[PDB]
Every structure is written in structure tokens, then in C-alpha cells.
Amino acid sequence: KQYIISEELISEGKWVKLEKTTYMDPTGKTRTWESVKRTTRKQTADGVAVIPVLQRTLHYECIVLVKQFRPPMGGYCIEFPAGLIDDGETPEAAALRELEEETGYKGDIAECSPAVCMDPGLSNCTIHIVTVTINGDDAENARPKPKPGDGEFVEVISLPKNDLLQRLDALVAEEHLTVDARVYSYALALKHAN
Amino acid sequence: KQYIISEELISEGKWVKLEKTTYMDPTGKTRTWESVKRTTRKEQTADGVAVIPVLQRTLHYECIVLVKQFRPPMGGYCIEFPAGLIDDGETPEAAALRELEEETGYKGDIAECSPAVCMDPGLSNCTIHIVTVTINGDDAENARPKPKPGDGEFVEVISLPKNDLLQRLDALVAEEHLTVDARVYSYALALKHA
């Protein structure tokens, strides 16, 4: 019933553009929407985000997260490791690469979502969520080496999967950080499960 | 270490603006970022709310109430948590219960309310509160609930069993062209991983 008629460019930067989308509402009335798009997509999705499950024997299972300054936010955020998929990269490969660059961990793919939307009222941005396990007892993960690209400055924060939501709340209460909505949603469902 | 130096308007629509953000990197070098913001945020603790609505009914498994709508940024239909922007002066909890009623017909009870969490912090400053709400589906109020759509709202309600959420989402994505929201997928994944 609903569909796009046309798109009018409003403004195009190097990384982000703003468009005015004309669409047909389900009554047959024509309406407009201000929409954001990245300029970098070519790919299954813009990006990947990695759910990294750090597994060490005789330890709690941890979810590995990253803390970074985020200029749109004006502050530090706590997020799953993540980045944009390179032209001709698979989402799995992007996930393992981003995980290694941001955390130093070498992981294995457990599963891969279809393309999921980030904020569909505002943008067309999509990611694959890639669940990855990390064998924390393997030698290659003993002293994990994070490899920043130019202009990346990433702190690693591993938190126990069994108390994830409480630990995140505590970081926000003490550290004045913003938690990512996907991280918080995952944490919630860990608590809400059965 | 890192902080904002300046924020220069590039393009302002009615609903969304683009900005050139100048910030200090942790090496002491000046860098820039293209940042998206909404024009609608006044004194709210966040732009919006998304509601995690747990429908509870005697001799039923618990369901997660979701909504399906056309999203002009995406050019297609998306499956999301019920959500909307917080009106000026409105609390997040009030916004959540209100949006849940408008979008689904259900009258919920507040369970918990997150701190402001970031939607896509590498792109935008947008934040929400994630509000958990229980719905007593045994109450007469919630017997045959009718969405009260606002002007330009056209929302379908989809209730899926919590105990099978990820597979049920996969089966909906396998049957037509639609995108599942990243927060919904994240929450469904943690339900599986728990």
C-alpha cells in the first residue's frame, strides 16, 4: 500500500546526506519525510555490530564492549564493537576484522543476522549483528592487540553476561557515559528471559 | 580527553538538521565529524521512547508486542518496538504508555525505565528511553484493543511469543520484504542466548 514516489536531495556531505522523501500514505494522500542516509553504502548493510562472547574456563562468560568518544553525542558511549563493511567484504569478515581492530580479540562466527535497521524513522542505516565467541584461553587472545585505524581511540570494557544490565547501569551512574540502545536491549532481554 | 570544540549548522530541515562537528582527539589534534540531530528536542531527557511491551495472559505464554509500519527513510516496512517522541513536558513513562496505547490499543503498566540510550551514536545525537511495560491481557480494557493512530500513522500490531521470538521474526522476514529493527533483533538474540 505505501511506497516511495521520489527523493529530493537537501544536502550532501562527505559521509551523510539529508533527503526529502515523497511517499504515498495508505489513504492515497502524498506526504513528505526528512530522511538521512550515509554516502558510503555500495553491500548487505552499512555496517556490522559484533556481539563478542568472551569464554574463559573457570570464569564468568563476558560480553566485550567498547567505549569511544562520539562526536554526534558530545560524549563517551558504550557500544558493541562495530564498523562499516568495506566494499566487497562479507559481513562475517567485517565482524571479525572490526572485533580485532577494536578489541585485539580473535573470534569465531556463531551466527549472523539479516540486515537490521538502526533508526528507521530517521535513517536508512542498517547493520548485521554478528554473534562471535572468543576463546579467551587460546594463546592468540592472551594479550589481545587492539589495532586502531586512523582517528580511532577505543577502550575495551568486558562485563559479565550474567549481570550485564546491572553493570551497565552502574557505569552510567558513576562514569557519565551513554549506553547504546542495542547493548541495553540485549542486556534487558538477558534479565527478562524466562 | 576528548570534547566538542564547535558545532556549525550545515542544513536545517523542519525535523532534522546536519552539523559539522569540531572536536579534540586524544592526541591533542583537532578533527571534524558530520553529525545528525533532531530539531524537536527541547528539555526532554531524550528524543523518544521505545516500549518493550510484555503481554501477560493466564494460560498463555508471554508475548512481546511489536508494530509494523512503513518507514519512509527505509523505503519499506519495518518491525519495531512501539515508539514515539516525548512531547514537551511529558515524562518518558507517560510517553511510553501513551505511545503504546496509540499504536497498539493496549493499556500497559510501567515495569522499568532505562536511562537515555543512544540510537546510532556514530551518526546522530538521538537518544531514547527504553521502557518496559507489562500488559495485563486478562483485563477487559485489553480484550479487543484498537490502535488510535494519529494523523499519518498507519500501524499493524504483531504479538510474538517471547519463548520463540527470534525464530518467529526470522519466519516473518522469510515471508515478505521487511526489516526488523536492530533493538528488537538484539533483544530476541539475548532471549536465545540466555
Ligand SMILES: CC(=O)Nc1cc(C)[nH]n1
Ligand atoms: C571520519 C568519519 O567517518 N566521519 C563521519 C561518519 C559519519 C556518519 N559522519 N561523519
Ligand SMILES: [Cl-]
Ligand atoms: Cl554465543
Ligand SMILES: [Mg+2]
Ligand atoms: Mg567502530
Ligand SMILES: [Mg+2]
Ligand atoms: Mg574499527
Ligand SMILES: [Mg+2]
Ligand atoms: Mg511510533
Ligand SMILES: [Mg+2]
Ligand atoms: Mg506514535
